[PDB]
Amino acid sequence: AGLEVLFQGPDSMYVLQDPIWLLMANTDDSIMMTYQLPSRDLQAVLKEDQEKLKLLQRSQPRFTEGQRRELREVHPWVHTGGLPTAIDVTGCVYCE
């Protein structure tokens, strides 16, 4: 499939092989032509996400005074508290 990479093998040589993410994937012909992501229930995934977010909450980025200054005229939503402009929409802007 033309996607292999040169791994370091034993101390002796290099080994040509598929990259891990490829080796981990089922990549047989049907999937490649026939596989579609399942349709999932919106709220169920938001709630499942929200569970995760509570765990990721203390590692979110923290902005110093100087960084808050830099961010003011580039990401207004920081000091304003709302959603960023480009992401407060209903979906793909072209389609809608």
44 belongs to the binding site for another protein (CB under 8 A): no
Q: How far is CA 22 from CA 3, 26, 59, 80, in A?
A: 8, 8, 30, 43
**Residue 72 CB partners (closer than 8 Å, separation 6+):** 78, 79
90 belongs to the binding site for another protein (CB under 8 A): yes
94 belongs to the binding site for another protein (CB under 8 A): yes
d(CA 94, CA 5): 37
52 belongs to the binding site for another protein (CB under 8 A): yes
Binding at 18: pick from another protein, Zn ion, none (beta carbon under 5-8 Å per type): none
Q: Are 53 and 47 in contact (CB under 8 A)?
A: no
> Where along the sequence are the contacts to another protein (CB under 8 A)?
1-8, 13-16, 19, 21-22, 24-27, 31-37, 39-40, 42, 45-46, 49-50, 52-53, 56-57, 59-64, 66-67, 70-71, 73-75, 77-78, 81-95
